[PDB]
mmCIF file of C-alpha atoms and ligand atoms in Angstrom:
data_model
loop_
_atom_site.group_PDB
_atom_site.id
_atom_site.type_symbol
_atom_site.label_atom_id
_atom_site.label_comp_id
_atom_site.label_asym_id
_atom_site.label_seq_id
_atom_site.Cartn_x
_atom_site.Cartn_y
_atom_site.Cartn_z
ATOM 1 C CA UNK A 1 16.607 -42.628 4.131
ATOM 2 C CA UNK A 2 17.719 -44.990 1.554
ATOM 3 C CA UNK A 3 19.242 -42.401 -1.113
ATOM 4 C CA UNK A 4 21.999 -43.428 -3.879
ATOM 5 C CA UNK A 5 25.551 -42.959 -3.238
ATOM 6 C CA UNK A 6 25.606 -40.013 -5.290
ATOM 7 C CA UNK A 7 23.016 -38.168 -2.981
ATOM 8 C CA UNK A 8 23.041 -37.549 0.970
ATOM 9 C CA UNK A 9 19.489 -37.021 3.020
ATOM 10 C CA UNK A 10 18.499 -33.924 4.104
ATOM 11 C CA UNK A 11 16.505 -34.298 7.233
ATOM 12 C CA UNK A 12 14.927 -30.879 7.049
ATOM 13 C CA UNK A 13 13.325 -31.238 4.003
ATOM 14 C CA UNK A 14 13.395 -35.240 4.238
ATOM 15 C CA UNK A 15 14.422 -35.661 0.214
ATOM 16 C CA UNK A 16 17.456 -37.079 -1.171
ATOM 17 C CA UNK A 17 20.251 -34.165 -2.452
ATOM 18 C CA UNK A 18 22.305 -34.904 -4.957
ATOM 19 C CA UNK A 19 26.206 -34.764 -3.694
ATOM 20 C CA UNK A 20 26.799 -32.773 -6.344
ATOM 21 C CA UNK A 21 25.138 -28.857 -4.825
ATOM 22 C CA UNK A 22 27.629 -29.600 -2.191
ATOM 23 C CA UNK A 23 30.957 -30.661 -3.696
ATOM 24 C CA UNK A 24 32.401 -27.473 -4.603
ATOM 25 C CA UNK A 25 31.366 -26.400 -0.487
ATOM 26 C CA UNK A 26 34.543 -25.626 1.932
ATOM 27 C CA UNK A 27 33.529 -29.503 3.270
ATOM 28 C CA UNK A 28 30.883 -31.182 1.284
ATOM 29 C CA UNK A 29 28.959 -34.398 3.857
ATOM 30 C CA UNK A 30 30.754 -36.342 5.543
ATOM 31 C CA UNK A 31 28.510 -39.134 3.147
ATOM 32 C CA UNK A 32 29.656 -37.324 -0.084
ATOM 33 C CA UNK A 33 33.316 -37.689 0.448
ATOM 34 C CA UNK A 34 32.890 -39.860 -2.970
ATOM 35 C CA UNK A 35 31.044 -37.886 -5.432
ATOM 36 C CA UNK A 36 33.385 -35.088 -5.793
ATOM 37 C CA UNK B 1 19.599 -30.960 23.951
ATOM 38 C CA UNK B 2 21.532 -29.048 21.482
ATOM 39 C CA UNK B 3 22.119 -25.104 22.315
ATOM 40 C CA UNK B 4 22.209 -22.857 19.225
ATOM 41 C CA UNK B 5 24.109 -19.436 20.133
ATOM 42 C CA UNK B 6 23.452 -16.388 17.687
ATOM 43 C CA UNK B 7 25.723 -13.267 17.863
ATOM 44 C CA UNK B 8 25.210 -10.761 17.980
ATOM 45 C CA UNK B 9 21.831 -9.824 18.957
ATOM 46 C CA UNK B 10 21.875 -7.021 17.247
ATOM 47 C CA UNK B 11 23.380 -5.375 14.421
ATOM 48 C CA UNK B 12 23.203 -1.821 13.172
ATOM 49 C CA UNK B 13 24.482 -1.764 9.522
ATOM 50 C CA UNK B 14 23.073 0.753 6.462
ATOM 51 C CA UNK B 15 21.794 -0.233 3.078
ATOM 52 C CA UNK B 16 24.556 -1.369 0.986
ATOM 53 C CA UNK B 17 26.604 -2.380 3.554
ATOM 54 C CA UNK B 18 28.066 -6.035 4.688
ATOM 55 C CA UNK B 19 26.659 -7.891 7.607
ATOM 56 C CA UNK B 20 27.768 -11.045 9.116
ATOM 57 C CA UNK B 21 25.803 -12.869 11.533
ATOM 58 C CA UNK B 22 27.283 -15.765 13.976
ATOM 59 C CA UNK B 23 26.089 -19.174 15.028
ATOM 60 C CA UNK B 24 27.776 -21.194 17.460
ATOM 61 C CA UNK B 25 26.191 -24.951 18.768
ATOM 62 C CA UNK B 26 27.245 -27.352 21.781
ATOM 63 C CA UNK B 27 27.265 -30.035 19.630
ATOM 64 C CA UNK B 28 29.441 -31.057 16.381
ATOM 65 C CA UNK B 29 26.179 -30.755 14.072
ATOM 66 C CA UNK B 30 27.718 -31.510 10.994
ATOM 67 C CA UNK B 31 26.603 -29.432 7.623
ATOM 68 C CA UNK B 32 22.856 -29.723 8.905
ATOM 69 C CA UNK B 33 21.867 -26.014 9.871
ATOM 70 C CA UNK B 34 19.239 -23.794 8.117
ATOM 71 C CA UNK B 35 18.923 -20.025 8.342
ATOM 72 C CA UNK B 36 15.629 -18.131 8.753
ATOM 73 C CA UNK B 37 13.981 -14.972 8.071
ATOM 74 C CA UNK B 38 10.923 -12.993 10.068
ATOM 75 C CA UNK B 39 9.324 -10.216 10.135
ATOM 76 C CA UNK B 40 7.334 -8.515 12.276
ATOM 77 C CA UNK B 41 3.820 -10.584 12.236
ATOM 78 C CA UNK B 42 5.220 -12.501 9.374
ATOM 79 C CA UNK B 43 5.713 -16.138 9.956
ATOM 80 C CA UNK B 44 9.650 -17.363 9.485
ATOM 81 C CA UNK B 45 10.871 -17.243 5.834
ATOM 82 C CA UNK B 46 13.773 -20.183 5.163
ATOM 83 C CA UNK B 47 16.822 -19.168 3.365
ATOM 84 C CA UNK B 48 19.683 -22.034 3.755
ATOM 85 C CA UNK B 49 19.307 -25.535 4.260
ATOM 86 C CA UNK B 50 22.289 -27.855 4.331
ATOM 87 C CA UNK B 51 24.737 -24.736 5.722
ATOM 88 C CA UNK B 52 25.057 -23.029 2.659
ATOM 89 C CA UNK B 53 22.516 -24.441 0.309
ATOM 90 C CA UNK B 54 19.458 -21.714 -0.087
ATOM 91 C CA UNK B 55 15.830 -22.393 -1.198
ATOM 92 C CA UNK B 56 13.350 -21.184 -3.903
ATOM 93 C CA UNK B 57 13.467 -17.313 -4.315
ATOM 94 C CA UNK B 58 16.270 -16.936 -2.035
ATOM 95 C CA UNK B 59 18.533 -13.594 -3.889
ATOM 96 C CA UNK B 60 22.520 -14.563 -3.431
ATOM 97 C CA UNK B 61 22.655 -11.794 -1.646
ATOM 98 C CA UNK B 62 22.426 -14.663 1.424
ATOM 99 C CA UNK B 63 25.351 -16.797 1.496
ATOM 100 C CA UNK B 64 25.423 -19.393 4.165
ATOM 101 C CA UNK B 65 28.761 -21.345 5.495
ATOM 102 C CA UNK B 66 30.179 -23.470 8.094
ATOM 103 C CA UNK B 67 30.565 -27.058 9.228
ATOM 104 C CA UNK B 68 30.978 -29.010 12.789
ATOM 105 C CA UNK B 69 30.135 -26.516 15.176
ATOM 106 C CA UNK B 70 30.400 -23.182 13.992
ATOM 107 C CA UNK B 71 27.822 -21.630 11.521
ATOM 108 C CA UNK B 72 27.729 -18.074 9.225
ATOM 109 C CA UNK B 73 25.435 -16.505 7.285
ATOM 110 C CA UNK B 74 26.621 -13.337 5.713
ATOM 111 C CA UNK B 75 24.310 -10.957 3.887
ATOM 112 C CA UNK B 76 26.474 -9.039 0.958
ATOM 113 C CA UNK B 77 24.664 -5.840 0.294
ATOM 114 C CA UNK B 78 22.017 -5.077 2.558
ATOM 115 C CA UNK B 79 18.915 -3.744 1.166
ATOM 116 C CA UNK B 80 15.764 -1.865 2.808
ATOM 117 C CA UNK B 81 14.043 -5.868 2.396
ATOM 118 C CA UNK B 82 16.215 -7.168 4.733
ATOM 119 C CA UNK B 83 16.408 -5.676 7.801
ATOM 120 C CA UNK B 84 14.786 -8.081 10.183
ATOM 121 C CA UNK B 85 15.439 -11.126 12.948
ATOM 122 C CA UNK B 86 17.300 -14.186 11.801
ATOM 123 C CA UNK B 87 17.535 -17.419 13.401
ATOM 124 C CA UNK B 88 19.419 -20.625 12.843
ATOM 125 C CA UNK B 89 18.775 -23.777 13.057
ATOM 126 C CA UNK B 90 20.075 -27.066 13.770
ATOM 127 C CA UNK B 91 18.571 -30.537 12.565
ATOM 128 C CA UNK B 92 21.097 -32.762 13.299
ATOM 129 C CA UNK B 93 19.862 -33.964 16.615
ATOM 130 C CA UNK B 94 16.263 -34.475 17.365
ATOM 131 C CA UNK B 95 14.856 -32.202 18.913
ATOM 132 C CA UNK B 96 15.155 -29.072 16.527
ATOM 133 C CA UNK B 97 16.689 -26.012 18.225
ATOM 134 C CA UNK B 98 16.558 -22.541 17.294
ATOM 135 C CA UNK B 99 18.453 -19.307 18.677
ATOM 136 C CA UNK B 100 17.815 -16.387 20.277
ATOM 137 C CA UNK B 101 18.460 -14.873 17.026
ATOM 138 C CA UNK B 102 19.675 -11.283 15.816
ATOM 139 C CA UNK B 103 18.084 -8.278 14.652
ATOM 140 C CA UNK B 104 19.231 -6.615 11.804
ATOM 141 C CA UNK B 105 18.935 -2.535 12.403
ATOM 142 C CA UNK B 106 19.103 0.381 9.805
ATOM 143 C CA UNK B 107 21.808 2.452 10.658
ATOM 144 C CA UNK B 108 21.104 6.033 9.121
ATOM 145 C CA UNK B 109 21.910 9.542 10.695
ATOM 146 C CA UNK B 110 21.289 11.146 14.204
ATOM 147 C CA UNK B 111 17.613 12.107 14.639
ATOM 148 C CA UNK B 112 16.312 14.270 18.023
ATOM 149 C CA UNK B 113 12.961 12.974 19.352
ATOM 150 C CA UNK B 114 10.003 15.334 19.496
ATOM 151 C CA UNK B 115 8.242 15.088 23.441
ATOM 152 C CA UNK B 116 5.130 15.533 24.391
ATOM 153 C CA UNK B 117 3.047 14.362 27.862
ATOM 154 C CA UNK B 118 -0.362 14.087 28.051
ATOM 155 C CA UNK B 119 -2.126 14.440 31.716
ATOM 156 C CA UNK B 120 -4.717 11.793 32.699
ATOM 157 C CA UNK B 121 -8.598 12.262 31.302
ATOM 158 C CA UNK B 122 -11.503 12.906 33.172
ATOM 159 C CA UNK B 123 -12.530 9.591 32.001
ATOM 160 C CA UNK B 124 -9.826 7.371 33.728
ATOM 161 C CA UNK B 125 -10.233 9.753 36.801
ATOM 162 C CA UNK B 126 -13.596 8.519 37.502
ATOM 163 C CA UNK B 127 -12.320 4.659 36.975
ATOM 164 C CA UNK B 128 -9.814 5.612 40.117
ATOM 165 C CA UNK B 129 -6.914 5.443 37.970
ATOM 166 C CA UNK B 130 -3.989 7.811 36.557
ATOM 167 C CA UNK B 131 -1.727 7.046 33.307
ATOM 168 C CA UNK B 132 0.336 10.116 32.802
ATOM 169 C CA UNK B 133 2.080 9.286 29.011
ATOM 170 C CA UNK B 134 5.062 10.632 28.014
ATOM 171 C CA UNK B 135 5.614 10.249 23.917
ATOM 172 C CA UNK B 136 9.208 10.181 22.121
ATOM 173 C CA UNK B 137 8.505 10.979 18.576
ATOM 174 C CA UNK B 138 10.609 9.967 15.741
ATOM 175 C CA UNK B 139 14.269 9.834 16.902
ATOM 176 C CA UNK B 140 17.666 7.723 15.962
ATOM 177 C CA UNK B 141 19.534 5.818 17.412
ATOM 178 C CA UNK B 142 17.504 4.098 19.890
ATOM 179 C CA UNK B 143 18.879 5.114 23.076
ATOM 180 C CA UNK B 144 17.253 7.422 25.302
ATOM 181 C CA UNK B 145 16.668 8.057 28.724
ATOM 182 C CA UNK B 146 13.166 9.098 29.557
ATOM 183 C CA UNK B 147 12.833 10.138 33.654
ATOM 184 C CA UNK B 148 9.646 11.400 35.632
ATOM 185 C CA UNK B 149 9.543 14.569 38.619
ATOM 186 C CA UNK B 150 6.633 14.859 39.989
ATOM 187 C CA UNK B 151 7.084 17.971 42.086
ATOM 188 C CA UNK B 152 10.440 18.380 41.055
ATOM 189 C CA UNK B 153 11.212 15.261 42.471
ATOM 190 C CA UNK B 154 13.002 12.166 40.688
ATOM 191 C CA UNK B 155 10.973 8.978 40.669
ATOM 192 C CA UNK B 156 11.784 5.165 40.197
ATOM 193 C CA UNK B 157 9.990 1.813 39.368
ATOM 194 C CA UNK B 158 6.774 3.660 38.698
ATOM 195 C CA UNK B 159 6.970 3.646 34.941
ATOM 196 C CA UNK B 160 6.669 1.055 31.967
ATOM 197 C CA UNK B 161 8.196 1.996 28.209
ATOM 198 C CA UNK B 162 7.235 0.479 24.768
ATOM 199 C CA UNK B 163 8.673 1.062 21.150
ATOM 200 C CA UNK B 164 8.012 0.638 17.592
ATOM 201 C CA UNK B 165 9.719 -0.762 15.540
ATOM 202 C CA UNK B 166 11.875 1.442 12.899
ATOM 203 C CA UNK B 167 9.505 3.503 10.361
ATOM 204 C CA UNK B 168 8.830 2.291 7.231
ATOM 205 C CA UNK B 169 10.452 5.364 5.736
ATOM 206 C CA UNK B 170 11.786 7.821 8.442
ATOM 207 C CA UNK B 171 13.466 4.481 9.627
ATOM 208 C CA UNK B 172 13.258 6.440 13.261
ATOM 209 C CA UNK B 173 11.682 5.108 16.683
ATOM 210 C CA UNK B 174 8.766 6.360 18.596
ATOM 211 C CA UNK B 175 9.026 5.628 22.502
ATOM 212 C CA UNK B 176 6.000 6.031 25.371
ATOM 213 C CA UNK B 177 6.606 6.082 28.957
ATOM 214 C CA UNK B 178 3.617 5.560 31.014
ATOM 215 C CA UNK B 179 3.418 6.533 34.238
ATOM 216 C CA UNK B 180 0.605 4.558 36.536
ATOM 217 C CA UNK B 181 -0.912 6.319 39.799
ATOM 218 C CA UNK B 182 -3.832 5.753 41.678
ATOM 219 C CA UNK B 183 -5.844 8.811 41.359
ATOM 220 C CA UNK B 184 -5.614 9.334 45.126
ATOM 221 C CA UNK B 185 -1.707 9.022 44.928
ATOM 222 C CA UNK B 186 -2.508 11.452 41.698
ATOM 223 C CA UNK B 187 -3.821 14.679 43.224
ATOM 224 C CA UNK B 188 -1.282 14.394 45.962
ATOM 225 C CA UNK B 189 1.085 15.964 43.700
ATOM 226 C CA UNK B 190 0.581 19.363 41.336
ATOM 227 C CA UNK B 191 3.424 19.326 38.791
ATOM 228 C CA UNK B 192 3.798 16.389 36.809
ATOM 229 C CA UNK B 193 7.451 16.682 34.161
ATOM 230 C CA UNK B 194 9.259 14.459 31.772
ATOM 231 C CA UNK B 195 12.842 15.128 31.271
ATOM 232 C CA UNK B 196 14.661 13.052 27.904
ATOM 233 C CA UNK B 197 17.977 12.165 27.226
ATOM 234 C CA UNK B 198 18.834 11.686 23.726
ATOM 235 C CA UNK B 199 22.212 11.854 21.656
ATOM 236 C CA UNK B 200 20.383 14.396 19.296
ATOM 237 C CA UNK B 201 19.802 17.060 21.824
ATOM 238 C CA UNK B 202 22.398 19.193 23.127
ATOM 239 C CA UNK B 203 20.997 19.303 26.480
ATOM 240 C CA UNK B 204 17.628 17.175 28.216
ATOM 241 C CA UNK B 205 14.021 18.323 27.101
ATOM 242 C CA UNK B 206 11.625 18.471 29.488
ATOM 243 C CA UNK B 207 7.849 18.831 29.048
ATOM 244 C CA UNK B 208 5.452 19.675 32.036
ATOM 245 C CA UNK B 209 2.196 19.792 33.159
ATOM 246 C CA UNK B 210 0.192 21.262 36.097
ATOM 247 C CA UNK B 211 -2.590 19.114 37.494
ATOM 248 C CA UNK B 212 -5.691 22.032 36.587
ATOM 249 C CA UNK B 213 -3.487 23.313 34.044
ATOM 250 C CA UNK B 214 -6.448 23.402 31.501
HETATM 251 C C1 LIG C 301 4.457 -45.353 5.194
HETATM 252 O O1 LIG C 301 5.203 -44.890 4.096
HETATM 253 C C2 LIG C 301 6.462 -45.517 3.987
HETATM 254 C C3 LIG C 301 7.307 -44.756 2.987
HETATM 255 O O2 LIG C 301 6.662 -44.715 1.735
HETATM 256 C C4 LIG C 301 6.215 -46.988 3.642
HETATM 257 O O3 LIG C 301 7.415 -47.707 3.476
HETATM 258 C C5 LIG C 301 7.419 -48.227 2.130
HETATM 259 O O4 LIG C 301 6.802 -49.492 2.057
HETATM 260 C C6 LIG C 301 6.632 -49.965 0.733
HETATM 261 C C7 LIG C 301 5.935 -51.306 0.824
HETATM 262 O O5 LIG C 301 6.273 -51.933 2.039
HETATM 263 C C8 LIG C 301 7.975 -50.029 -0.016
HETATM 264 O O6 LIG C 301 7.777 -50.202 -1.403
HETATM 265 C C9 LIG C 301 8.778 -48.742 0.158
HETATM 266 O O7 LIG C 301 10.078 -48.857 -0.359
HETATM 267 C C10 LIG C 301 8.862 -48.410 1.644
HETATM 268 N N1 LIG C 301 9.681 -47.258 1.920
HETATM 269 C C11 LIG C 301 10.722 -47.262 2.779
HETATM 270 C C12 LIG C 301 11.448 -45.947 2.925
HETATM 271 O O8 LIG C 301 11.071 -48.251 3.408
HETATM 272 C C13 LIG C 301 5.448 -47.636 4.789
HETATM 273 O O9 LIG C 301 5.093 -48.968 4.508
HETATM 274 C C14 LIG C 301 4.171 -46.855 5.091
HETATM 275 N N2 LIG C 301 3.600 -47.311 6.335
HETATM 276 C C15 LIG C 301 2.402 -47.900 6.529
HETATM 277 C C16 LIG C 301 1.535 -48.127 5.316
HETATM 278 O O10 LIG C 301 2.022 -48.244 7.639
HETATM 279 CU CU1 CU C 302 5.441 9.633 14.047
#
């Protein structure tokens, strides 16, 4: 997908999620090494 | 393809307890594994996308974690709702896998089956065929060991078993053991028994019947 650099794609549901649900996560994606 | 590996298969925990269920892949799969909920004749129910991420509805009871290759979900204080089979799931690689997934069983005190056998109708005799049934009634924990004498004498390979699932609110199994004759291998024999094994009976039960007992 073509998401911002402030989300990463979800392939599951096939959407854009924000980088932010997963900053605070014991390793947020490996595409949201930014965001936080 | 990818290989999903859920342990354990099963789980006996009470309400109000912790459980923690395991997930182990092949392959490095990143963050990208949901967890699922079913039900007997309920389709799944999803609870965590992303690893630890959960959808609409989803209590925080369920907390999901893990990265790379090794996955948790881990359930905080079990309640009577969630005592079922739960599968993950990785999307990383196409295809989508699953695994074998584990079941989630109410753990709750020692319960001694009630037995009962039931000879073969005049019905089924006429069809040329004998069930002999043997029925475990309400008992916990599963385990038991059902065996058939016909004339006293110990038999093998000659019997099928099925199970329900835990009650509703006894939270206790019932178990049948059908024994299938021909009714010409049927009336070679008189006295048809069933001795159980179960952890809630000091000693086997045995319940017999005599082929013109009636
Ligand atoms: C199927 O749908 C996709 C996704 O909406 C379409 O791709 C879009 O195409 C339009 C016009 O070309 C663009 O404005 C979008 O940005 C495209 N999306 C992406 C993700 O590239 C695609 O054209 C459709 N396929 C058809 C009509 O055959
Ligand atoms: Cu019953």
């Amino acid at each position: 997908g073509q998401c911002s650099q402030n989300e990463y794609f979800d392939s599951l549901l096939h959407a854009c999620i924000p980088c932010q649900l997963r900053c605070s996560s014991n390793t947020p994606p490996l595409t949201c090494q930014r965001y936080c | 393809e990818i290989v999903m590996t859920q342990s354990p298969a099963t789980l006996s925990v009470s309400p109000g307890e912790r459980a923690t269920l395991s997930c182990k892949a092949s392959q490095s799969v990143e963050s990208n594994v949901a967890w699922y909920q079913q039900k007997p004749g309920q389709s799944p129910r999803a609870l965590i996308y992303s690893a630890s991420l959960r959808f609409s509805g989803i209590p925080a009871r369920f907390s999901g974690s893990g990265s790379g290759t090794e996955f948790t979900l881990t359930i905080s204080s079990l309640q009577s709702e969630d005592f079922a089979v739960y599968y993950c799931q990785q999307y990383n690689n196409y295809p989508l896998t699953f695994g074998a997934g584990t079941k989630l069983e109410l753990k709750r005190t020692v319960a001694a089956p009630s037995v009962f056998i039931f000879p073969p109708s005049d019905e089924q005799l006429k069809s040329g065929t004998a069930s002999v049934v043997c029925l475990l009634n309400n008992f916990y924990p599963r385990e038991a060991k059902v065996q058939w004498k016909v004339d006293n004498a110990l038999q093998s390979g000659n019997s099928q078993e099925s199970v329900t699932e835990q009650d509703s609110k006894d939270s206790t199994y019932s178990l049948s053991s059908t024994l299938t004759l021909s009714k010409a291998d049927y009336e070679k024999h008189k006295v048809y028994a069933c001795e159980v094994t179960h952890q809630g009976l000091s000693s086997p039960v045995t319940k017999s019947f005599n082929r013109g007992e009636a």
